[PDB]
Design a protein around this motif. Sequence first.
Motif, short mmCIF file in Angstrom:
data_model
loop_
_atom_site.label_atom_id
_atom_site.label_comp_id
_atom_site.label_asym_id
_atom_site.label_seq_id
_atom_site.Cartn_x
_atom_site.Cartn_y
_atom_site.Cartn_z
N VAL A 1 0.81 -1.22 0.00
CA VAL A 1 0.00 0.00 0.00
C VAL A 1 0.84 1.27 0.00
CG1 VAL A 1 -0.40 0.32 2.49
CG2 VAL A 1 -2.19 0.95 0.78
N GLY A 2 2.11 1.16 0.43
CA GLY A 2 3.06 2.26 0.54
C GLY A 2 3.69 2.70 -0.76
N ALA A 3 3.37 2.06 -1.88
CA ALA A 3 3.93 2.41 -3.18
C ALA A 3 2.88 2.23 -4.27
CB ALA A 3 5.18 1.55 -3.46
N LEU A 4 1.62 2.58 -3.96
CA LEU A 4 0.48 2.38 -4.85
C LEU A 4 -0.13 3.71 -5.31
CD1 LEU A 4 -1.42 0.25 -6.18
CD2 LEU A 4 -2.73 0.24 -4.04
N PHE A 5 -0.94 4.34 -4.44
CA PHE A 5 -1.55 5.65 -4.63
C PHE A 5 -0.52 6.78 -4.69
CE2 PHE A 5 -4.30 3.36 -1.35
CZ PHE A 5 -5.13 2.73 -2.30
N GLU A 6 -0.82 7.91 -5.36
CA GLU A 6 0.06 9.06 -5.28
C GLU A 6 0.11 9.74 -3.92
OE1 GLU A 6 -2.74 10.61 -7.47
OE2 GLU A 6 -2.54 8.86 -8.79
N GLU A 7 1.26 10.34 -3.60
CA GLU A 7 1.38 11.31 -2.54
C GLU A 7 0.78 12.66 -2.91
OE1 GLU A 7 5.76 11.50 -1.91
OE2 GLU A 7 5.39 9.92 -0.44
#
Lengths: 50, 50
Positions: free
Chosen positions: A33-39
């Motif tokens: 989950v830590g490298a999926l959605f944008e910041e």
Amino acid sequence: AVNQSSSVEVSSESYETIFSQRIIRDLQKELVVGALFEELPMSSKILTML
Amino acid sequence: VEPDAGKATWVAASTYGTDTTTGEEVKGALKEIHFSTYKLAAKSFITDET
């Protein structure tokens, strides 16, 4: 043991064995989950939009 | 035909001196097999009158 059997007479005490200084582990987990959605970067405490 | 080989034991490790208690490494028995052979036969005859 290390005192048994005396080969042939002279024997040593316990803790005479060299070992390996390093740290390791068989497994970790799965993580995604830590490298999926944008910041979204934000300086403020909160942000509004219409 | 050689024997099969072989069931060997594990040394318990509380003694020394050979002194080794290895179950006896029996060499089995060498063996053979008899190849028997039979005879087969047949006859026939004729006559002048046929």
